[PDB]
Design a protein around this ligand. Structure first.
Ligand SMILES: *[C@@H]1O[C@H](CO)[C@@H](O[C@@H]2O[C@H](CO)[C@@H](O[C@@H]3O[C@H](CO)[C@@H](O)[C@H](O)[C@@H]3O)[C@H](O)[C@H]2NC(C)=O)[C@H](O)[C@H]1NC(C)=O
Ligand SMILES: *[C@@H]1O[C@H](CO)[C@@H](O[C@@H]2O[C@H](CO)[C@@H](O[C@@H]3O[C@H](CO)[C@@H](O)[C@H](O)[C@@H]3O)[C@H](O)[C@H]2NC(C)=O)[C@H](O)[C@H]1NC(C)=O
Ligand SMILES: *[C@@H]1O[C@H](CO)[C@@H](O[C@@H]2O[C@H](CO)[C@@H](O[C@@H]3O[C@H](CO)[C@@H](O)[C@H](O)[C@@H]3O)[C@H](O)[C@H]2NC(C)=O)[C@H](O)[C@H]1NC(C)=O
Ligand SMILES: *[C@@H]1O[C@H](CO)[C@@H](O[C@@H]2O[C@H](CO)[C@@H](O)[C@H](O)[C@H]2NC(C)=O)[C@H](O)[C@H]1NC(C)=O
Ligand SMILES: *[C@@H]1O[C@H](CO)[C@@H](O)[C@H](O)[C@H]1NC(C)=O
Ligand SMILES: *[C@@H]1O[C@H](CO)[C@@H](O)[C@H](O)[C@H]1NC(C)=O
Ligand SMILES: *[C@@H]1O[C@H](CO)[C@@H](O)[C@H](O)[C@H]1NC(C)=O
Lengths: 108, 117, 404, 117, 117, 124, 421
């Protein structure tokens, strides 16, 4: 499969930003989408697994959402810390292949 | 627990790269390991996956037979052959799934080893 | 002055982790049930009774995964089946062109495979994942029927149990009693619909980690049983293929349809009204969508029954904004959301019809859409009122005494 | 002893001083037997503990080590009178090891003085 | 174990220890059920013994066989000549003479130790 | 379990009698049917060990020691039993050496303890 | 001063207590028929608490585990013969014939035929005696023979030994320890190592491995048997190259040996070089107790359980020469052994009582470890050490040479400078 992200979305602090996760393929109706954050130059961390859940040590501000074939990662209470890149992937359970999104840069 | 990882290297076109990830603090048990890489200034692109329990391997299918991932019992080894200029990137490895083998979200990440050609 | 005095004989306790039994009435590590379980009620007692940080659920999930894998390793590994599979579509009857008659050059035999166990390749086609998955088949002797399994405590551990039918998950409930042997628990794998389980009597009961969060699921047992009359209307045939003889499907008997389910429309709509009455407790309208996507196992109501693996999307139901479902089945399956290992589910001849229960529901806010996808949540309903406890008869307290 | 749970220590102190069908029977007979033994052995370990403190099965014992205010303390009356004390341990729970040390030290010094005298 | 049961009270006072250490006193299923009866018996002996031991424990004895107290005997529980008590008043009949007063004695003993504490 | 306690008392055998003293206070702290049978012998041994610990406790009970570990008694030690000073008898010997020399007089000492306690309580 | 009591100080006194068997979970699970009774599995938690500054006078020729553990085998083995069927009416005037379909054997087998209530059977020359073509079993009348059940087998199963609480086992770990006298390293363990009930004469098959050690109640005495444990094992493979045919006759059901499929005598093999090397190591260790002249002569004589090398191999009991391994003379400076097969055997030198080995089908092959030797000094030219063995006790003593059972008395007294009040 394949999926495409908008290359950059920006906003002022305190806003509610929504980074889209398009590129939805025919099989993308299945194949859970996750969400990864990386501080540029650092090891990417996990944010959301199985389209809405949140690990224990991850800020409650982030949240997940699935909309039809597309997906969306919702942020509230934007801070200066959110200056990083967010990549979304999907586990194509048919051919057993993770496919990663292009890359979104959230700029304050 | 953490994924201790090898240091940087400098390889030539068509050379052989073999990076390492040692399971620090836990055994293989039922977890599965994936290898992802990042071209500097580009988004992550998948490379491979291994399941030490049953020896299952895979790839991104644009590494057609170039990549093999091995599990030794303690560490995991993935090798590159027939390098080109597009294969320079930081090659992360990560742990897939919690105990019980469930899940597919790779969350524990090694610091990231760099190979350049 | 205020001097300490030890008070042996104290009736205090401090809950702790432990290993528990696997007592049933009929799965080899089991022991038979206790004759006369004693439920000693306790008067005027309260304690912070939790059900989401419970330590028995994670024990129970570890047990089921083991019990699953223990009775599955010795079988005809489907590794020989890893070869190009010749196949053709079936038009003997259409009343739905999913099935495909596949022929294989074998140490030349034919078989029928569903579309969900054949992958698109690039004409002639191949199974979903065998070159990159160690498939396995199930012994015909074993039955996937859900056998009740009690959990009893070992020596020294006293299992408490909450009784207040108005029990909001966590939080105290001053009705606890020592229930050394637990009540019947049925390990049944299901998604979006807890088939068999308990039901609140007073009214629909809503319990979750923390409602305000939209990440944590919604686990609900409402009041009373709704049935789900659902069948497999296909007289299918099993004929052995010796390779160590994995089962397949040679052909079917005449008519073909889809595994329709029945839900008793009036009852289901009635129950949700009580449900939405409680959902509004914590004026804005409450609308049930039918999930979003991600995996048949999750998107649909992937419920085992009759020794077969059903995957049936609730798109039919949960379509209300304030029956009959085309429930396809898949041959191959990877249980427990696993990576790698996958089963085969050998076929069973004839038809199979089965109906028990829809006692519980799993919802995920955005209450709205349903999806559970994590069989750990299923067992957190049956074990909602049991926390193993280790008794500690010592005690210390200050007193106006001086000893010597 | 378990039935008395859910009462104040003034109430608890007084109550303390007074204080195949064959296959099912043979297996759960052992477990009932298994529990009985762990009742006695767990009793002895406690008796050993009360031995070195200077009690040895005196139930309502006493000791000559004061109750420092560093431990969770209030007016003695309320602890006796109205506070259910199944929750009292929850107050003195992370302090329960060091206090035993003072109980341990008190007897050792007490006997040493007795040994000298 | 009884020994000189009907002997003089003085005689029993000497031999209380009872010689010291002597004072304590289908095929698969058929063999198993016999074992349960055997083990159930032995533990029943121990449980009875400890309860008696702890019963002495509440009093100021804690397992010292003969044990003086601080409770003055009231001259009302059918008293007679002190000599006759240790001359012909055998133990068994001495029980029947007391009978009801044992509960009085048990209750009387309990408070004396506590008020000592 | 009590089973490990006994050879726990045997953990430090070659140590000095003084060394064992403090360590003593530190020491004061069809497969179903086959599973049924093993349950007996595993349980049968353990309850037997309990009787062993009670019997010694009861034996300690007759003497003026209640249930304490490092007990003392006021019965004189006549020089007839292994006349030798108290200095070395606690450092350069071992318990195995000590009792082997005493093993000719164990019973008389135990008997000597019985009346030593006995006289104390009557005239108390 | 006065005396003080100390409940808990370590104390020992040699005594004999009834131990109990110990086994393993998977090992117990693998118990088809009764190849050998349910036994307690031991948790693999070897305490092995190594004591320091410790010394207890071990002994092996007065040990009481040997007499104990040997008795356990006798009672267990008696139960192995209880449920099976007596062969009392089986013997009758036979019509055996020296039929030799093939010759390796040399006419060892006989084509016996009995007028049962008229079927033929095969029997070696050992299990049948001529009478006066009429023959009969060696000892049926004026004797008693009980055939083992065909389902059961006779393969050894490892057994551990554990003492009850209050008794501790002392295990000697010194590398150089001839059996008697003090042992420096005395490790206290509750459950001993994997004792093997190996049933064999002078050649110890597949037991514990030792330098080669020489152990004897008294060397000066010729009477006592000399045990020698090997440091390095010597492989022994021994085969029965004949497919046995088992015919069931409804008399109860006797199991006669039918005609063999296609006839080669059973035979054992030993690597001559490795045997020669080990024997030199033996003779070099023997000379420590003695330069001198050492000669080996084969078993002098006696019963067929001692004259030869008797051992068990896959439910079949073999009697083989050892003249090919004990014929040498040594100064300061592969081998094939012919065998015989017996089905009526009276192990443990019991009169009247004996068991009939049921036939085992096919060619029988087994491999084991030659780890121990039993030698008998003859009655000052040279000291010829003939192979003796005999008494089944010794084969236990090669394993239980390093264990004793001791009673611990935590109670103790001491004259301390302290007084009560
Ligand atoms: C149940 O879920 C709700 C929401 O999902 C949780 O409430 C959230 O609690 C956090 C922590 O207090 C709040 O974050 C805080 O926001 C303030 C904004 O001024 C900031 O100053 C703090 O530093 C912190 O970031 C969050 O706003 C709040 N959200 C809501 C809707 O109340 C609640 O804690 C959860 N309960 C449990 C037991 O997990
Ligand atoms: C090991 O065996 C040897 C014999 O092979 C033992 O030596 C024997 O010791 C006994 C005494 O215990 C001797 O009996 C006495 O001999 C003297 C003359 O030496 C005689 O005057 C007495 O009337 C009595 O017969 C015996 O002769 C002697 N034999 C030899 C050949 O030395 C040795 O004591 C045994 N040691 C062990 C480990 O027990
Ligand atoms: C042990 O070694 C000895 C010699 O080192 C072997 O001696 C041989 O024993 C056989 C027994 O069958 C003798 O054969 C018989 O001899 C008698 C003599 O009269 C004869 O009457 C019989 O018909 C039969 O031939 C053989 O002669 C003898 N060797 C010599 C040189 O005389 C012995 O076989 C070895 N094995 C055992 C188990 O003893
Ligand atoms: C045990 O072996 C010995 C020799 O290894 C056998 O004795 C031989 O017997 C034959 C019979 O006449 C003699 O001709 C040989 O000379 C003997 N051997 C030697 C070396 O002298 C003996 O037969 C074997 N045991 C049995 C039971 O057969
Ligand atoms: C199986 O996978 C291996 C390794 O990727 C590949 O070389 C081979 O072509 C695959 N075979 C099939 C039948 O897909
Ligand atoms: C819900 O219903 C829609 C059709 O309205 C269907 O396409 C979808 O697969 C169903 N399930 C999910 C997970 O949305
Ligand atoms: C017993 O058997 C022997 C042969 O072993 C035979 O000679 C004898 O006549 C039989 N009868 C007796 C005496 O029991």
């Amino acid at each position: 499969s394949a999926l495409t992200q908008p290359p950059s979305v920006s906003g002022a602090p305190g806003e509610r930003v929504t980074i889209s996760c398009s590129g939805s393929g025919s099989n993308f109706e299945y194949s859970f989408v996750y969400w990864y954050q990386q501080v540029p130059g650092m090891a990417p961390k996990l944010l959301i697994y199985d389209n809405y859940k949140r690990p224990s040590g991850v800020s409650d501000r982030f949240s997940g959402s699935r909309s039809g074939t597309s997906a969306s990662l919702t942020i509230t209470g934007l801070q200066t810390e959110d200056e990083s890149d967010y990549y979304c992937q999907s586990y194509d359970s048919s051919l057993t292949y993770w496919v990663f999104g292009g890359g979104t840069r959230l700029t304050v | 627990v953490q994924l201790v990882q090898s240091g940087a290297e400098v390889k030539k076109p068509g050379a052989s790269v073999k990076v390492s990830c040692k399971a620090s603090g836990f055994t293989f048990g039922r977890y599965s390991f994936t290898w992802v890489r990042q071209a500097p200034g580009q988004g992550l692109e998948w490379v491979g996956v291994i399941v030490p329990l049953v020896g299952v391997t895979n790839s991104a299918k644009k590494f057609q037979g170039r990549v093999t991932i091995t599990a030794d019992t303690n560490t995991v080894y993935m090798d590159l052959s027939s390098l080109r200029s597009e294969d320079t990137a930081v090659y992360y490895c990560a742990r897939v799934g919690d105990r019980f083998g469930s899940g597919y979200a790779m969350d524990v990440w090694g610091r990231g080893a760099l190979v350049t050609v | 002055n205020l001097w300490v005095t030890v008070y042996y004989g104290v009736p205090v306790w401090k809950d702790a982790e432990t290993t528990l039994f696997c007592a049933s009435d009929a799965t080899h590590a089991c022991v038979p049930t206790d004759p006369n379980p004693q439920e000693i009620h306790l008067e005027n007692v309260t304690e912070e009774f939790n059900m989401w940080k419970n330590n028995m659920v994670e024990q129970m999930h570890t047990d089921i995964i083991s019990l699953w894998d223990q009775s599955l390793k010795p079988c005809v590994k489907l590794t020989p089946l890893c070869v190009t599979l010749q196949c053709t579509n079936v038009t003997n009857n259409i009343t739905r062109g999913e099935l495909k008659n596949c022929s294989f050059n074998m140490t030349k035999v034919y078989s029928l495979f569903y579309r969900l166990d054949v992958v698109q390749i690039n004409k002639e086609y191949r199974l979903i994942n065998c070159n990159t998955s160690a498939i396995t088949q199930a012994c015909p002797k074993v039955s996937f029927e859900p056998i009740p399994i009690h959990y009893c405590a070992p020596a020294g551990f006293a299992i408490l149990k909450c009784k207040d039918k108005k029990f909001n998950g966590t939080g105290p409930c001053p009705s606890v009693s020592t229930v050394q042997c637990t009540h019947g628990i049925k390990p049944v794998v299901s998604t979006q619909l807890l088939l068999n389980g308990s039901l609140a009597e007073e009214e629909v009961m809503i319990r979750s980690e923390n409602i305000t969060n939209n990440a944590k699921n919604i686990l609900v047992q409402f009041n009373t049983p709704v049935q789900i009359n659902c069948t497999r209307p296909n007289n299918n045939t099993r004929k052995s293929i010796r390779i160590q003889a994995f089962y397949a499907t040679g052909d079917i008997i005449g008519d073909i349809r889809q595994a329709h389910c029945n839900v008793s429309k009036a009852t289901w709509n009635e129950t949700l009204g009580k449900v939405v009455k409680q959902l509004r407790k914590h004026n804005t309208i409450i609308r049930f969508a039918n999930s979003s996507g991600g995996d048949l196992e999750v998107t649909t109501h992937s419920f085992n029954c009759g020794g077969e693996f059903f995957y049936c999307n609730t798109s039919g139901l949960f379509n209300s904004t304030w029956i009959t479902l085309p429930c396809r089945i898949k041959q191959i399956i990877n249980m427990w959301q696993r990576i790698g290992q996958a089963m085969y589910a050998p076929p069973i001849q004839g038809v199979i019809r089965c109906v028990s229960n829809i006692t519980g529901l799993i919802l995920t806010r955005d209450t709205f859409r349903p999806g559970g996808g994590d069989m750990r949540d299923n067992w957190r309903s049956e074990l909602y009122k049991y926390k193993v406890v280790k008794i500690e008869p010592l005690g210390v307290a200050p007193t106006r005494c001086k000893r010597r | 002893f378990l039935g008395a749970a859910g009462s104040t220590m003034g109430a608890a102190s007084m109550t303390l001083t007074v204080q195949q069908h064959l296959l099912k029977l043979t297996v759960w007979g052992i477990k009932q037997l298994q529990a009985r033994v762990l009742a006695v052995e767990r009793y002895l370990r406690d008796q050993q503990l009360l031995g070195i403190w200077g009690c040895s099965g005196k139930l309502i014992c006493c000791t000559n080590v004061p109750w420092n205010s560093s431990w969770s303390n209030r007016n003695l009356s309320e602890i006796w009178d109205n506070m259910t004390w199944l929750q009292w341990d929850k107050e003195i729970s992370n302090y329960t090891q060091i206090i035993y040390g003072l109980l341990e030290e008190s007897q050792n010094q007490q006997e040493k003085n007795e040994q000298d005298l």
